[PDB]
Backbone as numpy.savetxt, mean C-alpha at the origin, in Angstrom:
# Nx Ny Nz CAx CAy CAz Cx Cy Cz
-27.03 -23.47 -8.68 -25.73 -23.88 -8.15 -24.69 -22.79 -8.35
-24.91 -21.67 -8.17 -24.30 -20.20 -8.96 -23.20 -20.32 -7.17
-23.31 -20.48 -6.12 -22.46 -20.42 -5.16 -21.69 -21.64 -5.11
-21.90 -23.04 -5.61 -21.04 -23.83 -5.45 -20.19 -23.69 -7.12
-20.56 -22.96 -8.27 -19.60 -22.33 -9.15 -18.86 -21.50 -8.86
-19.47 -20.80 -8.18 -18.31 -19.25 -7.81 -17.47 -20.25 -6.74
-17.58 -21.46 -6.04 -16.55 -22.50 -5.34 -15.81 -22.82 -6.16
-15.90 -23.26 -7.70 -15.47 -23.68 -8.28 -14.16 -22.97 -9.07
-14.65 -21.91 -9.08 -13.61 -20.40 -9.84 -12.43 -20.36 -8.80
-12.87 -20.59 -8.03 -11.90 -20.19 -6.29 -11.26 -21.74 -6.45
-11.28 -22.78 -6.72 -10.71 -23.43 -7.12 -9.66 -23.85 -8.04
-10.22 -23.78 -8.98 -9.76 -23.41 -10.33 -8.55 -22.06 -10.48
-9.12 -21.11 -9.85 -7.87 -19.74 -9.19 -7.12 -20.12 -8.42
-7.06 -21.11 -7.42 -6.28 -21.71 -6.06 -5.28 -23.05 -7.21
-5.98 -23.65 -8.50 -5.25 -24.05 -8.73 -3.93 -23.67 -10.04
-4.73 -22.26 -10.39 -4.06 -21.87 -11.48 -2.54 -20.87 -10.62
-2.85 -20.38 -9.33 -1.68 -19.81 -8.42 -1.55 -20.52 -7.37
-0.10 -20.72 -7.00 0.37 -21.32 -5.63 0.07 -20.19 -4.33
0.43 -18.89 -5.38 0.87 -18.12 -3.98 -0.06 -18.22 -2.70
0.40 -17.80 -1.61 -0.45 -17.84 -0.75 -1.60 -16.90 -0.44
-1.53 -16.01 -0.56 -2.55 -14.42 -0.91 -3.29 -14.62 -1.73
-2.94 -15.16 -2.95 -4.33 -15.65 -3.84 -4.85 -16.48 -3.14
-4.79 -17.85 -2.51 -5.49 -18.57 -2.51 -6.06 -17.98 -1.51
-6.00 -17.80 0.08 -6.38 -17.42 0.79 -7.56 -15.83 0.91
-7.28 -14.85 -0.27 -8.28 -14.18 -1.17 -9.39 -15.36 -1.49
-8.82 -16.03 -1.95 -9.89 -17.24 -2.95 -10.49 -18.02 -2.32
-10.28 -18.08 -1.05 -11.02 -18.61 0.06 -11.96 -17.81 0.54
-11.17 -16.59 0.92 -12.24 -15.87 1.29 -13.52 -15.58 0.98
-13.49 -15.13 -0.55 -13.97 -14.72 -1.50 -15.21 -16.26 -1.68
-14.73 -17.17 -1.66 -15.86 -18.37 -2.32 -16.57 -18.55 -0.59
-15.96 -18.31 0.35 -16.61 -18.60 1.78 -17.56 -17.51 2.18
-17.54 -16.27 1.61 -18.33 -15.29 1.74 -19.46 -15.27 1.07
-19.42 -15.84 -0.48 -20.72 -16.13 -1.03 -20.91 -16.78 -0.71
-20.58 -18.01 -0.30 -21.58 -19.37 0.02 -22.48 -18.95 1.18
-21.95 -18.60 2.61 -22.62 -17.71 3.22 -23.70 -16.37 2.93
-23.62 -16.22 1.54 -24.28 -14.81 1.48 -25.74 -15.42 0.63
-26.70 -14.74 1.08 -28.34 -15.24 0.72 -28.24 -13.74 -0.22
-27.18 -13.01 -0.68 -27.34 -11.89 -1.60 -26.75 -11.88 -2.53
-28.30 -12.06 -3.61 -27.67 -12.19 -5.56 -26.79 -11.53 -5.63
-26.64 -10.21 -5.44 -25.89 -9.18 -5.73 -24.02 -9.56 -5.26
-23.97 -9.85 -4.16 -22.89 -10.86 -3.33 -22.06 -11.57 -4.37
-22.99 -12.46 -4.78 -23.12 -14.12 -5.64 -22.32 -13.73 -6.91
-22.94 -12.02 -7.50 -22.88 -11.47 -8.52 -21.04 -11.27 -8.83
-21.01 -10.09 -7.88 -19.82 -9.55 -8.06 -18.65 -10.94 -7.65
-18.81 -11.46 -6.69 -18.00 -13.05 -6.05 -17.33 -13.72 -7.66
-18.64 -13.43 -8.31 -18.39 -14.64 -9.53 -17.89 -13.86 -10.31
-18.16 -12.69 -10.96 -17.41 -11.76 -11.93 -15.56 -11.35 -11.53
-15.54 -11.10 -10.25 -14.43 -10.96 -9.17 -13.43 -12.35 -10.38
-13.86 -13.33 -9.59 -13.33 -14.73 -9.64 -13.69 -15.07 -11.32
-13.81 -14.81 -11.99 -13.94 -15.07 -13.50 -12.87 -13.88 -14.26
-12.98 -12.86 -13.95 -11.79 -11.46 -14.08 -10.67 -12.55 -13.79
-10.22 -12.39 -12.30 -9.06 -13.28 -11.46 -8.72 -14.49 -12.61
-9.50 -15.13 -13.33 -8.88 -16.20 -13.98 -8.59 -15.52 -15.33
-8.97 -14.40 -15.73 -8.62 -13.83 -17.27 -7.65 -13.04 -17.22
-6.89 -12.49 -15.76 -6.13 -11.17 -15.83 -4.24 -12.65 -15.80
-3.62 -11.44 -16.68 -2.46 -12.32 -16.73 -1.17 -12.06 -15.80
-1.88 -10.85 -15.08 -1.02 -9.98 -14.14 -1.49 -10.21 -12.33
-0.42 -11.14 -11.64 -0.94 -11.69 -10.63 -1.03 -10.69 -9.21
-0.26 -9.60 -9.93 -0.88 -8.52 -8.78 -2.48 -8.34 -8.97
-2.35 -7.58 -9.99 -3.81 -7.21 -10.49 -5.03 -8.34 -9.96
-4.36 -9.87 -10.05 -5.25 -10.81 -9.89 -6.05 -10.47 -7.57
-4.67 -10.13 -6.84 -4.57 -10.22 -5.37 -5.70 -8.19 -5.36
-5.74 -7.61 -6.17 -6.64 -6.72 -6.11 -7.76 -6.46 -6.51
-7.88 -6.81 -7.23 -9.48 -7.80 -7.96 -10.09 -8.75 -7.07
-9.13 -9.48 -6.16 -10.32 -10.47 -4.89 -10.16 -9.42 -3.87
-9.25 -8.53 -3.45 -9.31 -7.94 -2.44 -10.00 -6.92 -2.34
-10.62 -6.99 -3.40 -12.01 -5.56 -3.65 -13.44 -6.27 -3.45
-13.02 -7.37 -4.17 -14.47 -8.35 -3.57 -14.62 -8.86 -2.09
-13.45 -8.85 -1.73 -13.80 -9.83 -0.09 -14.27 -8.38 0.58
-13.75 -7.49 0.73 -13.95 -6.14 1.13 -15.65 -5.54 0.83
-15.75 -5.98 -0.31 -17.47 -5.77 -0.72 -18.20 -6.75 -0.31
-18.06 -7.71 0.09 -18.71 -9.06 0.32 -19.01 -8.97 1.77
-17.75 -8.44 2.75 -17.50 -7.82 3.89 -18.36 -6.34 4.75
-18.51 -5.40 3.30 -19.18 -4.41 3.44 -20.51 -4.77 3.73
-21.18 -5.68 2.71 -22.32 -6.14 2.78 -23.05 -6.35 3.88
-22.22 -7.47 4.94 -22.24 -7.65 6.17 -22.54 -6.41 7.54
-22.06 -5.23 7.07 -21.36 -4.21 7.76 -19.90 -4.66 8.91
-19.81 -5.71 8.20 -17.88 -6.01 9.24 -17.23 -5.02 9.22
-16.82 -4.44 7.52 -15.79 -3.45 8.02 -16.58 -2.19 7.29
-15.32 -1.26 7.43 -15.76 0.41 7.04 -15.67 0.58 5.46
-16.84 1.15 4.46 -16.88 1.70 3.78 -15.85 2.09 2.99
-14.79 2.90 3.95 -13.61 3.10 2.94 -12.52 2.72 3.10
-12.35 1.12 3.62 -11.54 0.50 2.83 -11.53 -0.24 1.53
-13.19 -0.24 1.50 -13.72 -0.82 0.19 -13.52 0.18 -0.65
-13.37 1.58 -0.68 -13.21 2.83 -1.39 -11.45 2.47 -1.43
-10.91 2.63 -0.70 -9.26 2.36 -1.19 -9.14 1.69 -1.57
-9.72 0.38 -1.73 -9.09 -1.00 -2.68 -9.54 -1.01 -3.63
-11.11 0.07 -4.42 -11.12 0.38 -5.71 -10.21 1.54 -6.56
-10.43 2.70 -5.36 -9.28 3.62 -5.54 -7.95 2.86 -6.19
-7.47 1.92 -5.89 -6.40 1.36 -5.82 -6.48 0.53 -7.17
-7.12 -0.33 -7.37 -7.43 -1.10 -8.29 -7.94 -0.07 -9.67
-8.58 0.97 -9.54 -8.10 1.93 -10.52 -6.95 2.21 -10.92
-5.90 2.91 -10.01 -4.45 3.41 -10.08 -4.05 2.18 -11.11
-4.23 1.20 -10.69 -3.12 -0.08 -10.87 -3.98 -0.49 -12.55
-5.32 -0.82 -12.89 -5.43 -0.74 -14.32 -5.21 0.30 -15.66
-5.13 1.27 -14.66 -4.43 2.77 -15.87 -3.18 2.79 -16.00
-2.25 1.78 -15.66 -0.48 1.30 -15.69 -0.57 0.58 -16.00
0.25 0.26 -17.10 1.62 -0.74 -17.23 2.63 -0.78 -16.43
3.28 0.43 -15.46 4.28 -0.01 -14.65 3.81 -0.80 -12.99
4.62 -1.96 -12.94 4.38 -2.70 -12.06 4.60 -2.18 -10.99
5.69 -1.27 -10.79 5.97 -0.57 -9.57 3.95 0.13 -9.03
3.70 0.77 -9.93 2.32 1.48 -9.66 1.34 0.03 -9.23
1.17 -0.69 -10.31 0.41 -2.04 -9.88 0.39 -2.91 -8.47
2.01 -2.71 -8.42 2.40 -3.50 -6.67 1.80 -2.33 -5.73
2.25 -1.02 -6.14 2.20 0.38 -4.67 1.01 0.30 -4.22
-0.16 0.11 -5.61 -1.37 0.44 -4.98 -1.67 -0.78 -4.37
-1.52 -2.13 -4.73 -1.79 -3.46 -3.82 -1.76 -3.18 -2.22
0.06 -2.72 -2.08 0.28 -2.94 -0.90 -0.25 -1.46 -0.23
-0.34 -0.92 -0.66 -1.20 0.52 -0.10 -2.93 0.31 0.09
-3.22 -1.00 -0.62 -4.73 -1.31 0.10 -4.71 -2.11 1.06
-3.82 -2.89 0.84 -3.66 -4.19 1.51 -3.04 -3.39 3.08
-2.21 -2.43 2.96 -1.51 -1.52 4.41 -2.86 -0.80 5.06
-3.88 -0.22 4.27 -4.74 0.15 4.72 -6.04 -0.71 5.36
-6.51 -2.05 4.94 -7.10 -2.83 5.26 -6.28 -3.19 6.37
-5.45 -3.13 7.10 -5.11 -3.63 8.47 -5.30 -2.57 9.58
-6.13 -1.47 9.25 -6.06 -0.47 10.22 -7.58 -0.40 10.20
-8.11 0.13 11.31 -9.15 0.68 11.92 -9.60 2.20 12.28
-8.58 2.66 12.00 -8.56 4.42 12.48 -9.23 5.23 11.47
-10.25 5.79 11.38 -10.80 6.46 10.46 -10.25 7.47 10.00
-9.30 8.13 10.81 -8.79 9.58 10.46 -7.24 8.75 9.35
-6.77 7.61 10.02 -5.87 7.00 9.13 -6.01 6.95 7.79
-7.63 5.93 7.51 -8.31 5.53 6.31 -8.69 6.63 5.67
-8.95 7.88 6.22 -9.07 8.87 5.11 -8.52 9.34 4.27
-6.66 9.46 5.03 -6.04 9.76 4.87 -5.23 9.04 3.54
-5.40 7.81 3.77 -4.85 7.24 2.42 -5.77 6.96 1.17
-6.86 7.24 1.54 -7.98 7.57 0.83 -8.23 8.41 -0.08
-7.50 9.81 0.26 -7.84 10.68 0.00 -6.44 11.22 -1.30
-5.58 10.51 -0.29 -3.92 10.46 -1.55 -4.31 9.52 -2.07
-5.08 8.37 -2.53 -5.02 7.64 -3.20 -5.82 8.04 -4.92
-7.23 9.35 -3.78 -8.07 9.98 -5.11 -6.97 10.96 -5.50
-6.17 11.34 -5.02 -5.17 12.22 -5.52 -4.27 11.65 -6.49
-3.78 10.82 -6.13 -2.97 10.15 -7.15 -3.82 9.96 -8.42
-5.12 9.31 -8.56 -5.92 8.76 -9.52 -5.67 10.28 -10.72
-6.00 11.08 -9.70 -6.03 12.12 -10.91 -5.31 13.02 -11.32
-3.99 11.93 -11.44 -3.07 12.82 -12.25 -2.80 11.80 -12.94
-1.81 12.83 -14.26 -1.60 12.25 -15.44 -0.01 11.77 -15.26
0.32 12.14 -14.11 1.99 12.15 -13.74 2.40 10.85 -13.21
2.29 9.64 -13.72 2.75 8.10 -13.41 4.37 8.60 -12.49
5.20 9.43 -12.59 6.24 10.03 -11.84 5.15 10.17 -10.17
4.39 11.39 -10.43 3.57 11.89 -9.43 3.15 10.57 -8.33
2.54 9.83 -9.29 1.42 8.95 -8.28 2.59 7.60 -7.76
3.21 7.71 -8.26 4.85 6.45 -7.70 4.68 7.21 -6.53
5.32 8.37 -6.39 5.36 9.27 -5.34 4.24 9.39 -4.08
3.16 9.65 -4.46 2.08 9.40 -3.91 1.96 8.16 -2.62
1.98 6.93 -3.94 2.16 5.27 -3.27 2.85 5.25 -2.33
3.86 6.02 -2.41 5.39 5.56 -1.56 4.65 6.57 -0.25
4.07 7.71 -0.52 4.16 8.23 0.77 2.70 7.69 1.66
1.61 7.57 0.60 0.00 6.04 1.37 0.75 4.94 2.16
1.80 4.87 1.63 1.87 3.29 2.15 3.04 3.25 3.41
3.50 4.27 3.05 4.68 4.65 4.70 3.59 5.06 5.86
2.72 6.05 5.35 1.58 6.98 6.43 1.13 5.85 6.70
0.26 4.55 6.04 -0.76 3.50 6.15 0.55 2.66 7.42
1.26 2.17 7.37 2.50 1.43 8.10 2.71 2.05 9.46
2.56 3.10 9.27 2.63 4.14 10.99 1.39 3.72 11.34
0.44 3.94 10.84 -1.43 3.78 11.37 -1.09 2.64 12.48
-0.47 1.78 10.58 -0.91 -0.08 11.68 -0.32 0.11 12.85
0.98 0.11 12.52 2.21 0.07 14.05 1.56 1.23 14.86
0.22 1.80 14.86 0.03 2.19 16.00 0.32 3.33 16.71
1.00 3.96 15.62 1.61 5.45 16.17 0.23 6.68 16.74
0.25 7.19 17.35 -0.52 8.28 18.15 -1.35 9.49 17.09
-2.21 9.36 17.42 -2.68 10.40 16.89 -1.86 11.90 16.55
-1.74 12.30 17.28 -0.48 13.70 17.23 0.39 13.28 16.37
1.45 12.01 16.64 2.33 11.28 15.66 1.50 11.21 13.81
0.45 11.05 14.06 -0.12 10.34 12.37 -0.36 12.24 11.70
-0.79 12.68 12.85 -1.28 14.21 11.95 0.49 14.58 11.56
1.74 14.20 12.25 2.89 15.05 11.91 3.09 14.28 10.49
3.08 12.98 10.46 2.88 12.45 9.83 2.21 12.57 8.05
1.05 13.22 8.37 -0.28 13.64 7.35 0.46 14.92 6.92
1.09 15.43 7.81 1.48 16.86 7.27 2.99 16.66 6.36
3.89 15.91 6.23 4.75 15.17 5.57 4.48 14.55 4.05
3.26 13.66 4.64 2.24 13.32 3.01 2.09 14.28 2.77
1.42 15.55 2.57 1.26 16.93 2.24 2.99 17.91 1.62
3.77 17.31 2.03 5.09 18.48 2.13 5.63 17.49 0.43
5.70 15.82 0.70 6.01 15.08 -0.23 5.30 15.15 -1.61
4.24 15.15 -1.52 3.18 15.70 -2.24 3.20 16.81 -3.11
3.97 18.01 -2.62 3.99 19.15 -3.26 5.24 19.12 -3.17
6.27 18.43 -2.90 7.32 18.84 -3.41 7.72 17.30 -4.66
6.86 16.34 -4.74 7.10 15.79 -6.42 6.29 17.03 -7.46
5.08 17.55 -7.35 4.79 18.30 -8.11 5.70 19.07 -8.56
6.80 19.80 -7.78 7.44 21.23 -8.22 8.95 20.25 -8.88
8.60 18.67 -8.91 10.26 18.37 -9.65 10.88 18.01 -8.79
10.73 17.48 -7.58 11.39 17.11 -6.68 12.43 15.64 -7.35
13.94 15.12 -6.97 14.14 14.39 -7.52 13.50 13.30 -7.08
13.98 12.14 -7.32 13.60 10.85 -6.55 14.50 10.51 -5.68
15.55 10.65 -5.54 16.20 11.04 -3.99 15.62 11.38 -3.18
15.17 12.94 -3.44 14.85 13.62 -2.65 13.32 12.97 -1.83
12.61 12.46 -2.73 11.24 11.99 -1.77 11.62 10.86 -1.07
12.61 10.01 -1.63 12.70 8.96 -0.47 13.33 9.60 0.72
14.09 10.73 0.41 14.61 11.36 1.77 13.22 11.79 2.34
11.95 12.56 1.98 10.88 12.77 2.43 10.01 11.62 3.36
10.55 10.54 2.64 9.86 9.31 3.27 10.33 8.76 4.57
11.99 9.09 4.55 12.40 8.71 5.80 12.35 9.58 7.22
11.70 11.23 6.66 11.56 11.83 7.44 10.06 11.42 7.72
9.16 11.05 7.18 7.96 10.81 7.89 8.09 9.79 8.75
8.81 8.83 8.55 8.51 7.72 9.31 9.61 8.43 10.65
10.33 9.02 10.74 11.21 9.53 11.55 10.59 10.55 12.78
9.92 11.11 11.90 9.04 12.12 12.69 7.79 10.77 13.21
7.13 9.95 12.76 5.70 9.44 12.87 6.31 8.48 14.07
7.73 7.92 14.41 8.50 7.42 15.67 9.29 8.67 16.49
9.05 9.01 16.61 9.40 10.36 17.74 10.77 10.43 17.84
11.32 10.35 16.70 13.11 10.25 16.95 13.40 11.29 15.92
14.83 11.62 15.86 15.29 12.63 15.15 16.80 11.68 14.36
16.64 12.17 13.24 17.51 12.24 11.86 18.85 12.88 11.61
19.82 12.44 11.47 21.19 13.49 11.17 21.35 12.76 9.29
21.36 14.05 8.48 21.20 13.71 6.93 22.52 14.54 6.40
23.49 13.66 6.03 24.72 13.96 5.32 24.46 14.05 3.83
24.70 14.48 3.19 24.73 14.87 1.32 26.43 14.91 0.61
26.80 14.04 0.56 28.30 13.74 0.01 28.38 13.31 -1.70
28.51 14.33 -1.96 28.20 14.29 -3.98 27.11 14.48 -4.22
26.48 12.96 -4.70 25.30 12.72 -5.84 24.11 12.02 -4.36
24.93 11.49 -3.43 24.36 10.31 -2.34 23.92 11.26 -1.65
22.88 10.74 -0.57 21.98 10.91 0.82 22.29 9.93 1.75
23.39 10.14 2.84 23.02 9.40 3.87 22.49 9.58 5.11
21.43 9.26 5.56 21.13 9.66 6.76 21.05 8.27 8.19
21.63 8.83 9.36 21.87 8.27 10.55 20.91 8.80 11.29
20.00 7.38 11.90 18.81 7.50 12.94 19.89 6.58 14.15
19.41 7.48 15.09 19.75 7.30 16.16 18.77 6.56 17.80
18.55 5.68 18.44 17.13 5.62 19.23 15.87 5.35 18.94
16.39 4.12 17.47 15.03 3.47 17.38 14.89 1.86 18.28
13.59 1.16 18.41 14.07 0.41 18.62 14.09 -0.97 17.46
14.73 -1.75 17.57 14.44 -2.61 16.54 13.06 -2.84 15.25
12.31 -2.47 16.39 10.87 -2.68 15.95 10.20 -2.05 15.22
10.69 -0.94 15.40 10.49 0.34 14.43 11.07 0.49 13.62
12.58 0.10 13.91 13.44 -0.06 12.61 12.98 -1.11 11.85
12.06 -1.59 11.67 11.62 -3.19 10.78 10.86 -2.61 9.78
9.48 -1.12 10.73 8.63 -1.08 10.15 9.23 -0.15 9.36
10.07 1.36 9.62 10.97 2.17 8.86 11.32 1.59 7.37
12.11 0.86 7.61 12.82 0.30 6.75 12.12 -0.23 5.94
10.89 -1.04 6.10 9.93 -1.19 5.24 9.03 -0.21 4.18
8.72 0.56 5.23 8.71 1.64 4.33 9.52 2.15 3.23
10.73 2.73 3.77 11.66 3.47 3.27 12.16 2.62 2.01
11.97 1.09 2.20 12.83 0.05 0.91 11.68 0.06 -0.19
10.07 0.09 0.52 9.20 -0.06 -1.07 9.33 0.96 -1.50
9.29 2.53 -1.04 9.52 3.93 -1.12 10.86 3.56 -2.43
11.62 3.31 -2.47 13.02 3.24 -2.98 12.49 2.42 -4.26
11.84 1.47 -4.05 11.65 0.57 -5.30 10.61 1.79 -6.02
9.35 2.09 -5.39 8.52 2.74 -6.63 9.47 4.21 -6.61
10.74 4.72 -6.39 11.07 5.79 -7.19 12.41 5.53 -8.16
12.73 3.77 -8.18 13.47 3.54 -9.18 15.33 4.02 -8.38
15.38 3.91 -6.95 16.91 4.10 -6.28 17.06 3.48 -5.52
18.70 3.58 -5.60 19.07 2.35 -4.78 19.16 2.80 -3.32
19.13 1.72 -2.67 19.53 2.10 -1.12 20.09 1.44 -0.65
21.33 1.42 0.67 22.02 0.64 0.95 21.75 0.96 2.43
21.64 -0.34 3.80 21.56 -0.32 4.97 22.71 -0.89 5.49
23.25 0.27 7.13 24.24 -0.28 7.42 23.21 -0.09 8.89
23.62 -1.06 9.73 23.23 -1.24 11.59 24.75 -1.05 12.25
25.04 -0.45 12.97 25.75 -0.23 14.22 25.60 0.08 15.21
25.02 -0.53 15.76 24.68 -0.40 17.60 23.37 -0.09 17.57
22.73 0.57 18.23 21.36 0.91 17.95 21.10 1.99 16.83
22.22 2.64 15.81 21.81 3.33 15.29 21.89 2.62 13.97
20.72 2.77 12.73 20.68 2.60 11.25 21.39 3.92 10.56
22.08 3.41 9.34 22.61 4.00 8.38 21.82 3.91 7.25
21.20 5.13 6.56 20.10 4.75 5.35 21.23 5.41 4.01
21.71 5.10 3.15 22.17 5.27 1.95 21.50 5.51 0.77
20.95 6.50 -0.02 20.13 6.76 -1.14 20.94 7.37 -1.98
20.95 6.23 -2.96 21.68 6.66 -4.18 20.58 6.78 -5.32
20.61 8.17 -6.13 19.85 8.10 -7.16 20.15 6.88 -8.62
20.32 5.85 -8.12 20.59 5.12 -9.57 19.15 3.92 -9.94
């Protein structure tokens, strides 16, 4: 009865969290073994979902099933290889921290990457994600997150190939410029130029004191949703504030180092 227990864990997890992401993980996760005629499946399903009820950290808990549904998935051949590689990648990052900012970045940086299909995308955050792993710079790999999970956000929304490489080359510029001391201003300003460049529009960036404001001009709403998304988790994992103003079709981005 090892598949109607591992039902039971997914239960028991569905009743120990409301949120919706757990449970729906926890669905997944107990609907995939029951379906699966593979011990091995059965194995990890139940260890997955026995972890999930011991971890006290409910991110940690939404990356721990999202590594199993992904392996459970692999099994099948549904999806690609390395998204199951980014959501361990990830789930590494996030057990070598205590800071939650790192714990959430890498979530939503697997979770941004599991919605895409583009291989040259998935490498890509793949590959910053083994980058991040191996450094000792918890500064560094914040940095990192913020720029996986802006690049991963262009993928989804679909931006063009040509667009994702200007893009890739941005992850690369952000990248080496936290190494050399970059502030944390300064990369969220990096961040808003990727997503700026990865929507085919252009940037006017004012510097008045200590602040960064920059005015996009000719987005359309839609892009401004996904931007801004970016640009606001970007802001949370480097610890600054940001303030948004809208006037007409153009956004006002405000980065204050505090």
């Amino acid at each position: 009865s090892l598949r109607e227990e591992i039902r039971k864990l997914a239960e028991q997890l569905s009743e120990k969290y409301k949120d919706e992401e757990i449970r729906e993980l926890a669905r997944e996760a107990a609907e995939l073994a029951e379906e699966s005629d593979d011990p091995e499946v059965l194995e990890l399903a139940y260890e997955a979902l026995k972890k999930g009820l011991e971890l006290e950290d409910e991110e940690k808990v939404k990356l721990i099933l999202l590594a199993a549904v992904l392996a459970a998935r692999v099994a099948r051949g549904e999806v690609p290889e390395e998204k199951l590689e980014i959501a361990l990648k990830a789930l590494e990052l996030a057990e070598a921290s205590e800071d939650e900012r790192i714990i959430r970045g890498a979530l939503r940086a697997a979770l941004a990457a599991a919605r895409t299909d583009d291989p040259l995308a998935l490498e890509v955050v793949l590959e910053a994600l083994e980058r991040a792993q191996a450094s000792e710079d918890e500064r560094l790999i914040r940095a990192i997150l913020a720029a996986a999970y802006a690049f991963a956000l262009l993928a989804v929304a679909g931006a063009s190939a040509e667009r994702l490489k200007e893009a890739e080359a941005i992850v690369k510029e952000l990248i080496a410029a936290a190494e050399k001391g970059a502030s944390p201003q300064e990369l969220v300003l990096l961040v808003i130029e990727m997503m700026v460049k990865g929507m085919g529009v252009t940037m006017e960036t004012h510097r008045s004191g200590n602040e960064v404001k920059v005015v996009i001009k000719g987005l359309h709403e839609s892009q401004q949703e996904v931007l801004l998304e970016a640009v606001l988790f970007a802001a949370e994992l480097m610890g600054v504030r940001v303030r948004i103003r809208f006037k007409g079709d153009t956004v006002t981005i405000v980065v204050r180092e505090g």
